[PDB]
């Protein structure tokens, strides 16, 4: 089942500053009271991060490129954002990745889904609406896990695909800022490593409608793109990354 | 920065040791920098070549480290000879030498 | 010392002659705890099996597959593995496991093999020539045979062409052996493809029902995740052992650690990128990896003109790891420590000197 | 610990002996340097218990009895202000003995002037 | 300007950093030598007319 | 072939740096002597013979 959403309001997507966000732990190695230089796919400091809104009538589900990796930030309250779609053609011709977080558990499936133009979930005012794909024929990987998830919650995720390995990094942050990304530093812990082994060039954000037509709950998300670069990370006495330096940002940090 | 001269020597020696230890992580053109990985992954005819590349790289690193250690030893020996001269002429007597 | 100095006369002094290495004693191979067993109970211990034509295929992924339980069972008559040996199955790792289950006759078990021929291979279940996996068969006359005759198991007797490998044909279309069209009626020259095996308990061993499970192991370019369980040698602490923790190997002394790791972190590195801390996979505890003791071995002797007595200094080595005296320079063996202070004759280090009067330090 | 690596390393000859000999020469040279700088007196001179030097105060350079290290306040400040087959050999003269040598030199130059450097 | 050569050169480690550091030390040492020899007075004296 | 060129050029550069450091030590010794002569011969009268 697929449903076209024809009540959207036309507005250009916004842009804002990344500040010092998007830093994740590059590996599973403990380091204490040290300064470590690492070359990896990172989000540049103070970069231009694309801003999308969900407000009522804005419902931002465009088609975005994946490139080398995607940083996904979410200023979220009341649990609208539910999952992601990864793939190349997003149809039954190629093989695509599904990540969903419904009311019970987190499901990851690698199948050839015939995706809808507007994939979505729904909450009735209980969850009783799911319209993401019309078919699933060849499934290779399934993984059921625990639930990952004024704006009160900040969700940071990093999705990378290197050597057939899908690295998902996550961080949950209590915030009380109304509109934009708070300025500060928070290192993203690694959440899961998935052996999907598929080509990914395009991705989709999955949202949830609120029904009482449809109404979009207040949410905002940010999409940034990873580039191969070097960071200098500072590890404290407790092994937590507390500060970072972008090696190619300005001559002082260089 | 009053005691920079001693701290410079301490920093140089520690930095030389850190560089010498760090040079083990380099493969020097071999498939890996770990000897066990080469010995467990390859047959001895090609593992001999890979181990030879690691040996020549590490030996070059060690010879380089010894060379700057000898040069720094000469510099420290000159400084120590000067210090012994100052101890003999300034502390154990009164020196007429200007400055 | 004479060998090192290339002389038969040794002048009084201290000569660094050799090196000491605390040799490794045991091997500790700790990998993760055995959890998430693969659902082998729902394949082998199933209450009913499928026919050879509509053979059941179960795809087994993302779990731990213990193959030694199957190999060491006495309940299986055939455990013939093609393309791999059963001893290394419990070590190797595969991307997916295909468990095909069906029932055939006793005389038809030989046809479940690469390169064979017969009704089962040509029309019912075909194995490829390049097949990697195991064929497990056992007698099931107790379950699948009744006194009246069990007609629930069928086989495809005809088809125009032979099956491709790992093909399933569940079509019930009337076989055309002649030029005349069947038109859906089983008349002259037109027969029904699926025929039952009337399994009765009083049958011969070549006609008794045999449940066959074929496990197909393939390696694809994705990372292989269905790995056989590894074992865990009993952890030994405070000794120089060869440790292998989750594929990270080395040699060291594993002692208790006060470093509090974060839950996602497993290994620990210092400034010089050497592994000095590690997390045990079985029990979530932090262990410090101290490198095994290595030290210079120096010989302290007077002139050979005076005496042949010598003392041995192990530099930077504690005396419990080798007239034994502990110095800051290392462990000195063969010299009697005295409380008197004299001029330095043979320098040892850290304010310690040796002299001959026996050898005193 | 690789036996094959050592067997291949033996083909290159006595490079390792040369490097060890050079490092040993440097290590003994450091002790020789410390002997040359600090051990210029064979008598350990001591200051009198009464510090009556005609108004001259040497408390900042004489050893402090309160400190276990027997260092001067200046020397204590100086020590506070300085912060895979590799081994570090300890120096032949420890810090307290070097401090004792400096104390002997200070006592000689305070109580005897330059006379102790040229004889009795 | 060869990228492949630089990629192969990265396998040898921090030799280039060592050489640059040594040359930098020599370069600052020359200036220190000139300061030690010539800059021994902090007053610029002039002769009478 | 590039590896052979790299090892040859790296050996040449290391050799050049080695003699540069040795010459730097010699020039530093000469400069220390020159500073001593500037302090003792120009800024004072020296009793040291020759
Ligand atoms: C929702 O809208 C999309 C976009 O118009 C529809 O996708 C189109 O489907 C028609 C089918 O006749 C194709 O010819 C177009 O090329 C499609 N366009 C795109 C951009 O994919 C989709 O079918 C609509 N959903 C439903 C249920 O009608
Ligand atoms: C010599 O100098 C020392 C240090 O300047 C004097 O010690 C001080 O004595 C006063 C008075 O007793 C104290 O308040 C200070 O705290 C002391 N300073 C230190 C560092 O201990 C000392 O009195 C002077 N005179 C003699 C004769 O020793
Ligand atoms: C971000 O990009 C938009 C256009 O893509 C541009 O108008 C805006 O100025 C950019 N922001 C910054 C801070 O460069
Ligand atoms: C969540 O998804 C899983 C997998 O599709 C499903 O089994 C479960 O019932 C779903 N829960 C809800 C509340 O929809
Ligand atoms: C994928 O599905 C299609 C249709 O279901 C099928 O024809 C094709 O063989 C399948 N491919 C694989 C690799 O399973
Ligand atoms: C992945 O897909 C993109 C576009 O579909 C293509 O350009 C690229 O070559 C593909 N890569 C692989 C490894 O298949
Ligand atoms: C590290 O943890 C300790 C408690 O174990 C805490 O007292 C200390 O403040 C922490 N340090 C930082 C920088 O958070
Ligand atoms: C299946 O049944 C047999 C006989 O009761 C039993 O020994 C075995 O443990 C069961 N499970 C498997 C996986 O074979
Ligand atoms: C591993 O299993 C042992 C029992 O064999 C148990 O005591 C221990 O708690 C387990 N550890 C983890 C991390 O599950």
Distance CA A200, CA A160 (A): 10
By alpha-carbon position, which residue is closest to atom 2 of ligand 4?
A: A102
Contact A137, A93 (CB under 8 A): no
Where exactly are the structural domains of chain A?
Answer: 14-254
Q: What is the DSSP letter of C87?
A: G
How far is it, in rounded angstroms, from Cα A166 to Cα A110?
A: 12
The DSSP string of C172-230 is -PPEE-SSS--TTS--TTEE-SEEE--B-TT--TTTS-EEEEEEEEE--SSPP-EEPPP
Chain F residues with CB under 8 Å of E7 CB are none
What's the resolution in A?
Answer: 2.6
Nearest to D92 by CA among A162, C5, C327, C37: C327
Find the length of chain F.
Answer: 50
Residue A33 CB less than 6 A away from ligand 7: no
3+ Cβ–Cβ pairs closer than 8 Å linking E and F = yes
| Strand A202-211 to A83-87 pairing | antiparallel
CB–CB contacts below 8 A, B to D? 83
Ligand nearest to the CA of A48: 3
Return phi, psi of residue D38, to 5°.
-95, -30
User: If interface means Cβ-Cβ distance under 8 Å, which residues of chain C face chain B?
Assistant: 249, 271-274
- Please state, in angstroms and rounded to a whole number, the distance separating the CA atoms of residues F50 and F41: 11
Cα-Cα-Cα-Cα dihedral sign, residues C316, C320, C324, C326 = positive
**Which of B56, B66, B89 to probe the D interface (max D CBs under 10 A)?**
B66
Query: Residue D10 carries which DSSP code?
Result: G
Q: Report the C-alpha gap between C181 and C185 in whole angstroms.
A: 9
Q: Give residues with Cβ within 8 angstroms of F9, minimum separation 6.
A: none
**Cβ separation C351–D92 shorter than 8 A:** yes
Query: What is chain B's length?
Result: 99
Cβ-Cβ contacts under 8 Å for E46 (sequence gap 6 or more) = none
What architecture does CATH give domain A14-254? Sandwich (2.60)
F8-17 contacts at long range (C-beta below 8 A, 24 or more positions apart): F10/E12, F10/E15, F13/E19, F14/B64, F14/E15, F14/E19, F17/E19, F17/E22, F17/E23
Contacts of A112 (CB under 8 A, 6+ apart): A91, A92, A93, A94, A95, A96, A136, A137, A138
Tokens found for residue D103: 């104390």
- Give me C175's structure tokens: 């076989």
Residue with tokens 């017969």: C118
CB C55 within 8 A of CB C102: yes
**Helix (H/G/I), strand (E/B), else coil: F1:** coil
Residues D55, D69: contact at Cβ < 8 Å?
no
- What distances in angstroms separate CA A108 from CA A158, A166, C96, C106, one per listed residue? 16, 12, 17, 43
Which of C61, C221, C268 comes nearest A29 by C-beta?
C268
Nearest CA in chain C to D24: C16
What is the Å distance from ligand 6's center to A199 Cα?
6
User: In the structure encoding, which two tokens stand for residue A223, read together?
Assistant: 């999409």
Q: Which approach determined this entry?
A: cryo-EM
What are C136's strand-pairing partners?
Answer: C79, C213
Residue A144 pairs with which residues in a beta bridge?
Answer: A107
Where on the phi/psi map is residue A73: left (φ > 0), alpha (ψ -120 to 50), or beta? beta
B27 in contact with E at a CB cutoff of 8 Å? yes
Name residues whose C-beta falls within 8 Å of residue A96's C-beta, 6 or more positions apart in sequence: A85, A86, A87, A88, A90, A110, A111, A112, A113, A115, A198
Query: Do residues A109 and A115 lie in contact, with contact meaning Cβ atoms separated by under 8 Å?
Result: no
From A1, A117, A204, the mutation candidate for ligand 1 (largest count of ligand atoms within 8 A of CB) is: A117
Alpha-carbon distance of F13 to F7, in angstroms, equals: 10
Ligand (nearest to CA of C31): 9
CA gap F7, E38 in Å, rounded: 42
With contact defined as beta carbons under 8 Å apart, do A33 and A45 qualify? no
Helix (H) or strand (E) holding A201: none
Q: Report phi then psi at A251, rounded to 5.
A: -60, -25
CB-based burial label for D120 (10 Å; 0-12, 13-18, 19+): exposed
State how far the Cα of A133 lies from the Cα of A206, in Å rounded to an integer: 12
Do D and B touch, 3+ Cβ pairs within 8 Å? The answer is yes
The C-alpha atoms of residue C275 and residue C249 are separated, in whole angstroms, by 10
Which pair of structure tokens corresponds to residue D12?
Answer: 């290159």
Residues C218, C149 contacting (CB under 8 angstroms): no
State both tokens at B30: 């071999």
Rounded CA separation C332/C353 (Å): 11
Report the alpha-carbon distance of residue C243 to residue C233 in Å, rounded. Answer: 10
Whole-angstrom distance, CA of residue C212 vs CA of residue C134: 10
Please state the length of chain A. Answer: 254
3-state secondary structure of F5: helix
**Phi/psi at A176 (5° precision):** -135, 25
Distance B18 CA to ligand 9 centre (A): 39
Backbone φ and ψ of C349, nearest 5°: 125, 160
Concatenated DSSP letters of B16-59: HHHHHHHGGG--TTSS-S-HHHHHHHS-HHHHHHHHHHHHHHHH
Closest CA to A230 of A254, A213, A247: A247
């Amino acid at each position: 089942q697929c449903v076209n959403l024809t009540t959207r309001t036309q507005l250009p997507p916004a842009y804002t500053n990344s500040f010092t966000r998007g830093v994740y732990y590059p590996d599973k190695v403990f380091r204490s009271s040290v300064l470590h230089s690492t070359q990896d796919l990172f989000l540049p400091f103070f970069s231009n991060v694309t801003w999308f809104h969900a407000i009522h009538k804005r419902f931002d589900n465009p088609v975005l490129p994946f490139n080398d990796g995607v940083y996904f930030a979410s200023t979220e309250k009341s649990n609208i954002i539910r999952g992601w779609i990864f793939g190349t053609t997003l149809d039954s011709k190629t093989q695509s990745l599904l990540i969903v977080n419904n009311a019970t558990n987190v499901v990851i499936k690698v199948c050839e889904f015939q995706f809808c133009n507007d994939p979505f979930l729904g909450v009735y005012y209980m969850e009783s609406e799911f319209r993401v794909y019309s078919s699933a024929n060849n499934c290779t990987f399934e993984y059921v896990s625990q639930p990952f998830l004024n704006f009160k919650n900040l969700r940071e995720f990093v999705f990378k695909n290197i050597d057939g390995y899908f690295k998902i990094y996550s961080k949950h942050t209590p915030i009380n800022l109304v509109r934009d990304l708070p300025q500060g530093f928070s290192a993203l812990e690694p959440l899961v490593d998935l052996p999907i082994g598929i080509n990914i060039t395009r991705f989709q954000t999955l949202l949830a409608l609120h029904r009482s037509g449809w109404t979009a709950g207040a949410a905002a998300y940010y999409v940034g793109y990873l580039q191969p670069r070097t960071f200098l990370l500072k590890y404290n006495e407790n092994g937590t990354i507390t500060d970072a330096v972008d090696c190619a940002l300005d001559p002082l940090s260089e | 920065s009053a005691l920079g001269k001693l701290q410079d020597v301490v920093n140089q020696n520690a930095q030389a040791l850190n560089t010498l230890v760090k040079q083990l992580s380099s493969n020097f053109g071999a498939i890996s920098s770990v000897l066990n990985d080469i010995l467990s992954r390859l047959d001895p005819p090609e593992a001999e070549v890979q181990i030879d590349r690691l040996i020549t790289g590490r030996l070059q690193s060690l010879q380089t480290y010894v060379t700057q250690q000898l040069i720094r030893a000469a510099e420290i020996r000159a400084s120590a000879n000067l210090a012994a001269t100052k101890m003999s002429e300034c502390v154990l007597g009164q020196s007429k030498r200007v400055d | 010392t004479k060998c090192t100095l290339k002389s038969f006369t040794v002048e009084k002094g201290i000569y660094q002659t050799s090196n000491f290495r605390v040799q490794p004693t045991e091997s500790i191979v700790r990998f993760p705890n055995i959890t998430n067993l693969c659902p082998f109970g729902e394949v082998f211990n199933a209450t009913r099996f499928a026919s050879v034509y509509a053979w059941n295929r179960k795809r087994i992924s993302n779990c731990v597959a213990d193959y030694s339980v199957l190999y060491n069972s006495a309940s299986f008559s055939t455990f013939k593995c093609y393309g791999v040996s059963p001893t290394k199955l419990n070590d190797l790792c595969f991307t997916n496991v295909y468990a095909d289950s069906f029932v055939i006759r006793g005389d038809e078990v030989r046809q479940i093999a690469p390169g064979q021929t017969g009704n089962i291979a040509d029309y019912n279940y075909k194995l490829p020539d390049d097949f990697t996996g195991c064929v497990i068969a056992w007698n099931s006359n107790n379950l699948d045979s009744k006194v009246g005759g069990n007609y629930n198991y069928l086989y495809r007797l005809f088809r125009k062409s032979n099956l491709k490998p790992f093909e399933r044909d569940i079509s019930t279309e009337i076989y055309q052996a002649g030029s005349t069209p069947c038109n859906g009626v089983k008349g002259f020259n037109c027969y029904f493809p699926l025929q039952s095996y009337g399994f009765q308990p009083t049958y011969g061993v070549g006609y008794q029902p045999y449940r066959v499970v074929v496990l197909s192991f393939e390696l694809l370019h994705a990372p292989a995740t269905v790995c056989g369980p590894k074992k865990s040698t009993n952890l030994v602490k405070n000794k120089c052992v060869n440790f292998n923790f989750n594929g990270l190997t080395g040699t060291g002394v594993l002692t208790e650690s006060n470093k509090k790791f974060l839950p996602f972190q497993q290994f620990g590195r210092d400034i010089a990128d050497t592994t000095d801390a590690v997390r045990d996979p079985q029990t979530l505890e932090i262990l410090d990896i101290t490198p095994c003791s290595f030290g210079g071995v120096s010989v302290i002797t007077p002139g050979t003109n005076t005496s042949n007595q010598v003392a041995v200094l192990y530099q930077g080595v504690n005396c419990t790891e080798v007239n034994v005296f502990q110095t800051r320079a290392g462990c000195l063996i063969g010299a009697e420590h005295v409380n008197n202070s004299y001029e330095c004759d043979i320098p040892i280090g850290a304010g310690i000197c040796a002299s001959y009067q026996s050898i005193i330090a | 610990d690789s036996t094959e690596c050592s067997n291949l390393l033996l083909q290159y000859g006595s490079f390792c002996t040369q490097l060890n000999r050079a490092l040993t020469g440097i290590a003994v040279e450091q002790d020789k340097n410390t002997q040359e700088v600090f051990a210029q007196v064979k008598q350990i001179y001591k200051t009198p218990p009464i510090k009556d030097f005609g108004g001259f105060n040497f408390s900042q350079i004489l050893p402090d009895p309160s400190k276990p290290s027997k260092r001067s306040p200046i020397e204590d400040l100086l020590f506070n202000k300085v912060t895979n087959g590799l081994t570090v050999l300890p120096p032949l003269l420890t810090d307290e003995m070097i401090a004792q040598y400096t104390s002997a030199l200070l006592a000689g130059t305070i109580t005897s002037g330059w006379t102790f450097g040229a004889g009795p």
